[PDB]
Scaffold this active site. Structure first.
Site, mmCIF file in Angstrom:
data_model
loop_
_atom_site.group_PDB
_atom_site.id
_atom_site.type_symbol
_atom_site.label_atom_id
_atom_site.label_comp_id
_atom_site.label_asym_id
_atom_site.label_seq_id
_atom_site.Cartn_x
_atom_site.Cartn_y
_atom_site.Cartn_z
ATOM 1 N N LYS A 1 22.010 110.909 91.555
ATOM 2 C CA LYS A 1 21.373 112.026 92.070
ATOM 3 C C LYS A 1 21.727 111.884 93.577
ATOM 4 O O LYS A 1 21.579 112.782 94.393
ATOM 5 C CB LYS A 1 20.069 112.090 91.934
ATOM 6 C CG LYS A 1 19.767 112.404 90.114
ATOM 7 C CD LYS A 1 18.198 112.402 90.162
ATOM 8 C CE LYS A 1 17.763 112.604 88.621
ATOM 9 N NZ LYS A 1 16.663 112.600 88.156
ATOM 10 N N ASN B 1 18.078 97.995 80.522
ATOM 11 C CA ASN B 1 17.150 98.804 81.094
ATOM 12 C C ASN B 1 15.772 98.230 81.175
ATOM 13 O O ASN B 1 15.020 98.141 80.036
ATOM 14 C CB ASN B 1 16.967 100.352 80.205
ATOM 15 C CG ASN B 1 15.878 101.209 81.075
ATOM 16 O OD1 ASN B 1 15.035 100.717 81.804
ATOM 17 N ND2 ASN B 1 15.604 102.322 80.278
ATOM 18 N N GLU C 1 14.826 108.744 98.158
ATOM 19 C CA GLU C 1 13.251 108.663 98.509
ATOM 20 C C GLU C 1 12.637 107.619 99.247
ATOM 21 O O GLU C 1 13.346 106.549 99.135
ATOM 22 C CB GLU C 1 12.179 108.367 97.124
ATOM 23 C CG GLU C 1 12.629 109.540 95.891
ATOM 24 C CD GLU C 1 12.092 109.151 94.503
ATOM 25 O OE1 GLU C 1 11.537 108.253 94.711
ATOM 26 O OE2 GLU C 1 12.762 109.791 93.680
ATOM 27 N N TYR D 1 9.026 115.002 88.533
ATOM 28 C CA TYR D 1 10.325 114.499 88.513
ATOM 29 C C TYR D 1 11.180 114.886 87.546
ATOM 30 O O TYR D 1 10.732 114.887 86.026
ATOM 31 C CB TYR D 1 10.338 112.928 88.588
ATOM 32 C CG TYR D 1 11.655 112.115 88.735
ATOM 33 C CD1 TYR D 1 12.452 111.831 89.725
ATOM 34 C CD2 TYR D 1 12.087 111.609 87.543
ATOM 35 C CE1 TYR D 1 13.713 111.531 89.976
ATOM 36 C CE2 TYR D 1 13.685 110.923 87.661
ATOM 37 C CZ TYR D 1 14.041 111.097 88.604
ATOM 38 O OH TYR D 1 15.365 110.297 88.698
ATOM 39 N N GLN E 1 13.316 115.578 81.151
ATOM 40 C CA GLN E 1 14.762 115.668 80.394
ATOM 41 C C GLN E 1 14.883 117.052 79.830
ATOM 42 O O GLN E 1 13.720 117.792 79.538
ATOM 43 C CB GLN E 1 14.981 114.660 79.371
ATOM 44 C CG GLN E 1 14.942 113.540 80.071
ATOM 45 C CD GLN E 1 15.183 112.232 78.883
ATOM 46 O OE1 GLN E 1 14.821 110.876 79.236
ATOM 47 N NE2 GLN E 1 15.512 112.623 77.777
ATOM 48 N N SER F 1 18.190 104.797 85.413
ATOM 49 C CA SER F 1 18.340 104.192 84.071
ATOM 50 C C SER F 1 19.312 104.982 83.032
ATOM 51 O O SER F 1 19.102 106.053 83.186
ATOM 52 C CB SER F 1 17.047 103.779 83.501
ATOM 53 O OG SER F 1 16.404 102.903 84.351
ATOM 54 N N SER G 1 19.964 107.690 87.245
ATOM 55 C CA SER G 1 19.451 108.725 88.119
ATOM 56 C C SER G 1 19.883 108.120 89.353
ATOM 57 O O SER G 1 19.690 109.010 90.569
ATOM 58 C CB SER G 1 18.058 108.916 88.027
ATOM 59 O OG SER G 1 17.851 109.397 87.050
ATOM 60 N N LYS H 1 16.414 104.416 95.431
ATOM 61 C CA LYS H 1 16.547 105.285 94.116
ATOM 62 C C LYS H 1 16.770 104.103 92.998
ATOM 63 O O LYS H 1 17.355 103.377 93.036
ATOM 64 C CB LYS H 1 17.628 106.064 94.091
ATOM 65 C CG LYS H 1 17.623 107.087 92.999
ATOM 66 C CD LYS H 1 16.546 108.288 93.276
ATOM 67 C CE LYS H 1 16.347 109.078 91.904
ATOM 68 N NZ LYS H 1 15.704 108.505 90.830
ATOM 69 N N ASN I 1 15.336 115.799 85.628
ATOM 70 C CA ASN I 1 16.612 116.006 85.639
ATOM 71 C C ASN I 1 17.019 117.370 85.478
ATOM 72 O O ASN I 1 18.176 117.765 86.324
ATOM 73 C CB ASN I 1 17.271 115.092 84.159
ATOM 74 C CG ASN I 1 17.331 113.680 84.423
ATOM 75 O OD1 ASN I 1 17.125 113.140 85.434
ATOM 76 N ND2 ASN I 1 17.701 112.869 83.360
HETATM 77 C C1 ZX0 Z 1 17.156 108.758 85.724
HETATM 78 O O1 ZX0 Z 1 17.802 107.602 85.683
HETATM 79 C C2 ZX0 Z 1 16.138 109.431 84.883
HETATM 80 C C3 ZX0 Z 1 14.818 108.506 85.127
HETATM 81 N N1 ZX0 Z 1 15.103 108.012 86.388
HETATM 82 S S1 ZX0 Z 1 13.732 107.158 87.160
HETATM 83 O O2 ZX0 Z 1 14.176 105.840 86.964
HETATM 84 O O3 ZX0 Z 1 13.781 107.217 88.624
HETATM 85 O O4 ZX0 Z 1 12.578 107.669 86.679
HETATM 86 C C4 ZX0 Z 1 14.851 107.403 84.167
HETATM 87 C C5 ZX0 Z 1 15.816 107.904 82.920
HETATM 88 N N2 ZX0 Z 1 16.575 109.012 83.445
HETATM 89 C C6 ZX0 Z 1 17.577 109.784 82.884
HETATM 90 O O5 ZX0 Z 1 18.224 110.081 83.617
HETATM 91 N N3 ZX0 Z 1 17.601 109.521 81.584
HETATM 92 C C7 ZX0 Z 1 18.814 109.843 81.061
HETATM 93 C C8 ZX0 Z 1 19.190 108.254 80.396
HETATM 94 C C9 ZX0 Z 1 20.540 108.818 79.566
HETATM 95 C C10 ZX0 Z 1 20.404 108.862 78.165
HETATM 96 N N4 ZX0 Z 1 19.661 110.302 77.786
HETATM 97 C C11 ZX0 Z 1 19.554 111.149 78.857
HETATM 98 C C12 ZX0 Z 1 18.406 110.972 79.814
HETATM 99 CL CL CL Z 2 18.375 115.467 80.907
#
Ligand code: ZX0
Ligand code: CL
Length: 362
Positions: free
Chosen positions: A66, A343, A272, A150, A119, A318, A63, A315, A152
């Protein structure tokens, strides 16, 4: 030799116990301090073939992607191809007549569309028609603009619509325009074959190997693979947007504007923000599981707030096999990147960062 010795001692002291405690195979740190980059590399990119982590090793940043997505949107915005108050359906005819008639681009960007989930459901594959159908049928849980959850699919749609407003695919815009504008040659959505030797292995439970697979709006939400050196270059662009050609300077500035607060955190596009200094425990809470997973009522600002000066912008991101964290302090010309091929908990990432920042202040 004292300054170099002291910095190494500080970063080692912050990183080494956390790597051991979280069984992290490989970890890269990059720090921008007083206008110079400093790199510290630890452990193994691949346990099996013995490739060591270097400042050029590619990690999945999840993320943290983003913030790149937000930069592309910033470009669309400051180029007058979209406005933050546009309704989402202005930019995709497929969404006309859906609930996205009543949801703004800002809502999507800042996770306040009304309960879009963390997700995409597992039933939604990486397929334009399935994504189309998903949004067409989705209904808000609560009023758009009222609660942060929060998500995706929320910011993913924001990025996808920003690309539509520019008339080109998101992935192509990133490769052909955004990454080159930022001077990033070690940053990829789709790692070239010639660069695969640099791509770290990710590690999960029982050290199973884990690299990220295809998913809906993956590029927009979590698509980037980059090195600690390149990610620090991006942090430096954020610290000094005026060093870039004007259109891209404005694009970066657009990611340094806060729209509402939840607790100690002010929400920008991608980034953020927190007041600085703030306690480690408060910074960890802002990056905690409940912050991510539960809806929070927002405190809207009377006008957009400049995210600069005595603030920390950050930010987390994972994937199944990787954990990334980026933090910078605009008013101190200070930034850091911490990339790992496990992770491991967000709180531990923040703990490393805080120890480094605290030591640089001391
Ligand atoms: C971003 O990394 C988001 C979420 N972000 S956070 O740590 O700021 O809360 C943690 C997990 N996430 C994802 O985008 N997860 C994807 C990881 C790739 C495998 N499946 C799709 C979901
Ligand atoms: Cl997703």
């Amino acid at each position: 030799e004292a300054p170099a010795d002291r910095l190494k001692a500080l970063v080692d002291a912050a990183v080494q116990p956390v790597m051991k405690a979280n069984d992290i195979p490989g970890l890269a740190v990059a720090i921008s301090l007083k206008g110079e980059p400093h790199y510290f590399s630890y452990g193994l990119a691949s346990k099996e073939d013995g490739r060591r982590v270097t400042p050029e090793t590619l990690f999945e940043i999840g993320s943290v992607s983003k913030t790149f997505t937000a930069t592309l949107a910033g470009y669309a915005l400051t180029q007058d191809k979209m406005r933050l108050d546009d309704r989402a359906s202005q930019h995709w005819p497929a969404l006309q007549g859906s609930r996205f008639d009543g949801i703004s681009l800002l809502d999507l960007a800042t996770y306040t569309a009304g309960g879009l989930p963390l997700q995409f459901p597992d039933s939604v594959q990486k397929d334009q028609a399935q994504i189309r159908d998903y949004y067409r049928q989705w209904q808000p849980t609560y009023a758009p603009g009222s609660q942060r959850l929060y998500s995706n699919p929320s910011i993913g749609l924001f990025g996808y619509l920003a690309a539509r407003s520019l008339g080109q695919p998101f992935e192509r815009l990133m490769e052909q325009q955004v990454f080159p504008a930022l001077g990033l040659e070690q940053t990829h959505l789709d790692v070239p074959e010639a660069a695969l030797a640099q791509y770290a292995q990710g590690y999960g439970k029982d050290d199973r190997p884990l690299r990220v697979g295809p998913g809906p709006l993956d590029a927009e939400g979590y698509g980037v693979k980059t090195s600690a050196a390149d990610l620090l270059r991006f942090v430096d662009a954020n610290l000094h947007p005026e060093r870039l050609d004007r259109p891209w300077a404005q694009a970066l500035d657009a990611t340094h504007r806060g729209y509402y607060k939840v607790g100690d955190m002010t929400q920008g596009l991608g980034w953020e923000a927190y007041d600085w200094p703030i306690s480690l425990k408060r910074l960890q809470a802002g990056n905690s599981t409940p912050m991510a997973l539960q809806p929070h009522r927002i405190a809207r600002l009377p006008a957009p707030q400049a995210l600069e000066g005595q603030r920390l912008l950050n930010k987390t991101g994972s994937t199944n096999g990787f954990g990334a964290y980026v933090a910078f302090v605009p008013g101190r010309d200070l930034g850091l990147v911490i990339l790992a091929n496990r992770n491991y908990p967000n709180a531990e990432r923040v703990k490393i960062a805080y120890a480094i920042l605290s030591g640089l202040e001391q």
